[PDB]
């Protein structure tokens, strides 16, 4: 009555045969799971990766978190935190003491139902000022992946068994059914797994993944992680609810790192007709989030999770829509979607054939859109043009000054404003000079582009 738990998300228990190929499995469950936004996956009894560490030698910099509903929090940035330092042992000791002191009970006898109830009480009661700490970063020499990775150091035969698993999250990016694989541009924050060390009540605010990608989260060990998820189709519903209750979160900001997010009771969303689902993720289980599926949660206690973004062929059209949406909001991109597409086209001979077919369809849309934009800017009197290798420019040197989109297919420059670019939607936002002073900078002619797409079609057969 104070808190009503959302209904449970789907839980899948695949056979080893069903489980072995993550991409085939995800495609199979997608008609069910995309209706709930998140789902949980229990691997077959078979699958049991080694979880081995000396907690005395693993160090990380803790982040501090206040727990107030609707209060703005800043998105985690790589290597922030500060200079302070915990080992996994001293953090665990701190975390277990916090929880057992908080409830005056041993940590495992606190029911998950109760921690959940207490979480939503304490975040709404700002007479309470509970602060907690957590770890969040990519693998480093001081704190590595919880999955086996190659290095020597001699690996056990059981560790070797899991090196090339499709569910070893170090691998998921670089597998052939993943389209982020082919991206040459390092984007560490996105293609590499994140490591999360949690404690009771430490939480992750409501968000969707960059570029509306999937995510997959594995809980290596510890107390459960509680999740709330919202299906992709209700993303704008949720955002509307949020913009009315917490308008502060929707101000334009300097960059991608200054992104603001918040804790919000799922009952509040359910009250405004946003469908929400929940789950408790236990050690050894996976949670999968689908494209544009909002999710949030908190930890039941001391634990260690690993998560990574990924993008399947199914995602490609949504990826294009996402960048369009980013343009409308003037939100920064993590990478150029078109650059990714053209990179794959340039590698058509070595592409998985299903990938080739789907890339070809997205490329066809890209080319027709580009054709139309170029005709529009020509009618605005932009006549001069020159080829430009956009992929060579640092990202922050090829952003539209208006909408911040990362340019690749083309942009407009002007001698009156050296170094500045606009995308072709924002030709009028660059300078006040006469039209003929403008230059179309383009990566490819239409005559370059159609053969590239043809190579994909041949590969797809």
Ligand X SMILES: O=C(CSc1ncc(C(=O)O)c(=O)[nH]1)c1ccccc1
Does the annotation flag 439 for ligand binding?
no
Return the number of the residue (59 or 425) whose C-beta is nearest Zn ion: 425
Strand ranges, E, within 345-409: 384-387
Asked if 207 is part of the footprint of ligand X (rule: CB under 6 A), the reply reads yes
| Residue 299 among known ligand-binding residues | no
Looking up tokens 């973004």, which residue turns up? Answer: 309
The pair phi, psi for residue 219, each rounded to 5°, is -95, 105
Q: Is 305 in the site for ligand X (CB under 6 A)?
A: yes
Q: DSSP characters for 156-175?
A: PHHHHHTTT-TTSTTTGGGS
Distances (CA, A) of 186 to 189, 192, 339: 9, 10, 13
Segment contacting Mn ion (CB under 5 A): 214-222, 237-245, 344-352, 453-461?
214-222
Dihedral of alpha carbons 455, 423, 386, 343, sign:
negative
Q: Give which of 29, 2, 33, 31 is closest to 295, Cα–Cα.
A: 33
For Zn ion, which residue of 172, 340, 341, 400 counts as binding (CB under 5 A)?
Answer: 400
For the chain, give the number of residues. Answer: 461
Nearer to Cl ion, 199 or 452 (CB): 199
Choose among Zn ion, Cl ion, ligand X, none what residue 423 binds, the Cβ cut-off being 5 to 8 Å by kind. Zn ion
- 387 bridge partner residues: 442
Neighbours of 96 (CB within 10 A): 17
403 binds Zn ion (CB under 5 A): yes
CB closer to Cl ion, 91 vs 201:
201
Residue 225 among known ligand-binding residues: yes
Is residue 391 within 8 Å of residue 337, measured between CB atoms?
no
Q: Which is nearer to ligand X, 195 or 411 (CB)?
A: 195
426 makes contact with Zn ion (CB under 5 A): yes
209 is in an annotated binding site: yes
Q: Per CB under 6 A, which of residues 147..206 are in contact with ligand X?
A: 196, 198, 204-205
Could you give the CA distance from residue 213 to residue 115 in angstroms, rounded to a whole number? 30
Return the H-helix or E-strand segment holding 133. Answer: strand 131-138
Distance of alpha carbon 104 from alpha carbon 85, whole angstroms: 27
402 labelled binding-site residue: no
Which residues, 6+ apart, have CB-to-CB distance to 420 below 8 Å?
401, 413, 414, 430, 431
List binders of ligand X among 323-362 (CB under 6 A).
Answer: none
Structure tokens at 49: 């990766």
Given Cl ion, ligand X, Mn ion, none, residue 76, with its beta carbon under 5 to 8 Å by kind, binds ligand X
State which of positions 59-98 bind Cl ion (CB under 5 A).
68
Return the closest-CA partner of residue 321 out of 373, 257, 366: 366
Query: What x-and-dash track marks residues 42-81 binding ligand X by CB under 6 A?
Result: ---------------------------------xx-----
One residue of 30, 402, 439, 457 binding Zn ion per CB under 5 A: 402
The one of Cl ion, ligand X, Zn ion, none whose footprint includes residue 426, by CB under 5 to 8 A per kind, is Zn ion
State yes or no: residue 259 binds ligand X (CB under 6 A). yes
Task: State which residue, 68 or 385, has the beta carbon closest to Cl ion.
Answer: 68
- Residue 253 contacts which entry, ligand X, Zn ion, Cl ion, none (Cβ below 5-8 A, type-dependent): none
How far does the chain reach from its first CA to its final CA, in angstroms?
Answer: 59
Answer yes or no: is 211 a known binding residue.
no
Binding flag, residue 261, ligand X (CB under 6 A): yes
Query: What is the per-residue binding string for ligand X in 117-136, x denoting contact by CB under 6 A?
Result: -------------------x
**Other C-beta atoms lying within 10 Å of the C-beta of residue 41:** 23
d(CA 214, CA 291): 5
Contact set for Cl ion, span 7-36 (CB under 5 A):
none
Q: How many CB atoms lie within 10 A of CB 109?
A: 9
Asked if residue 296 belongs to a known ligand binding site, the reply is: no
Among Cl ion, Zn ion, ligand X, none, residue 340 binds (CB under 5-8 Å by kind): none
| Contacts made by residues 385-389, CB under 8 angstroms, sequence distance 24+ | 385/439, 385/440, 385/441, 385/442, 386/439, 386/440, 386/441, 386/442, 387/441, 387/442, 387/443, 387/445, 388/441, 388/442, 388/443, 389/443
Annotated binding site for Fe cation: 207, 209, 295
Which residues bind to Zn ion, rule: CB under 5 A? 400, 402-403, 423, 425-426
Annotated binding site for 2-oxoglutarate: 134, 215, 217, 225
Annotated binding site: 134, 207, 209, 215, 217, 225, 295
Which residues bind to Mn ion, rule: CB under 5 A? 215
Which residues bind to Cl ion, rule: CB under 5 A? 68, 126, 128
Which residues bind to ligand X, rule: CB under 6 A? 75-76, 136, 196, 198, 204-205, 207, 225, 259, 261, 305
């Amino acid at each position: 009555s104070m808190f009503l738990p959302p209904p449970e998300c789907p839980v899948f228990e695949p056979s080893w045969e069903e489980f072995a190929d993550p991409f085939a499995f995800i495609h199979k469950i997608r008609p069910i799971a995309e209706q709930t936004g998140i789902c949980k996956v229990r691997p077959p009894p078979d699958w049991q990766p080694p979880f081995a560490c000396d907690v005395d030698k693993l160090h990380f910099t803790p982040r501090i978190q206040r727990l107030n509903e609707l209060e703005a929090q800043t998105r985690v940035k790589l290597g922030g935190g500060g200079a302070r330092d915990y080992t996994l042992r001293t953090f665990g000791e701190m975390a277990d003491a916090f929880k057992s002191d908080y409830f005056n009970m041993p940590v495992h006898m606190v029911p998950t139902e109760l921690v959940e109830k207490e979480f939503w009480r304490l975040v709404s009661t700002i007479e309470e000022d509970v602060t907690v700490e957590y770890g969040a970063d990519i693998a480093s020499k001081e704190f590595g992946s919880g999955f086996p990775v190659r290095d020597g150091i001699k690996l056990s035969p059981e560790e070797e068994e899991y090196l090339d698993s499709g569910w070893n999250l170090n691998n998921m990016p670089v597998m052939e059914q993943s389209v982020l694989a082919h991206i040459t541009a390092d984007i560490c924050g996105m293609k590499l797994p994140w490591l999360y060390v949690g404690m009771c009540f430490s939480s992750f605010c409501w968000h969707i993944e960059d570029h509306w990608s999937y995510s997959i989260n594995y809980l290596h060990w510890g107390e459960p992680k509680t999740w709330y998820g919202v299906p992709g189709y209700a993303a704008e519903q949720l955002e509307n609810v949020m913009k009315k209750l917490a308008p502060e979160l929707f101000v334009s900001q300097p960059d991608l790192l200054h992104q603001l997010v918040t804790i919000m009771n799922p009952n509040t969303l359910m009250t405004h007709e946003v469908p929400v689902y929940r789950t408790n993720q236990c050690a050894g289980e996976f949670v999968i989030t689908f494209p544009r599926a909002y999710h949030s949660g908190f930890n039941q206690g001391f634990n260690f999770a690993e998560a990574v973004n990924f993008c399947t062929v199914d995602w490609l059209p949504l990826g294009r829509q996402c960048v369009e949406h980013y343009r409308l909001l003037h939100r920064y991109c993590v990478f150029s979607h078109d650059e990714m597409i053209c990179k794959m086209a340039s590698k058509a001979d070595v592409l998985d054939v299903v990938v080739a077919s789907t890339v070809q369809k997205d490329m066809a849309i890209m080319i027709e859109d580009e054709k139309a934009l170029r005709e529009t800017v020509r009618k605005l009197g932009v006549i001069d043009s020159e080829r430009m290798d956009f992929e060579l420019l640092p990202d922050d040197e090829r952003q539209c000054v208006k909408c911040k989109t990362t340019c690749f297919m083309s942009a407009i420059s002007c001698s009156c404003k050296p170094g500045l670019l606009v995308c072709l939607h924002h030709v009028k936002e660059l300078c006040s000079c006469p039209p003929y002073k403008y230059k179309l900078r383009y990566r490819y002619t239409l005559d370059d582009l159609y053969p590239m797409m043809n190579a994909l079609k041949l590969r797809a057969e």
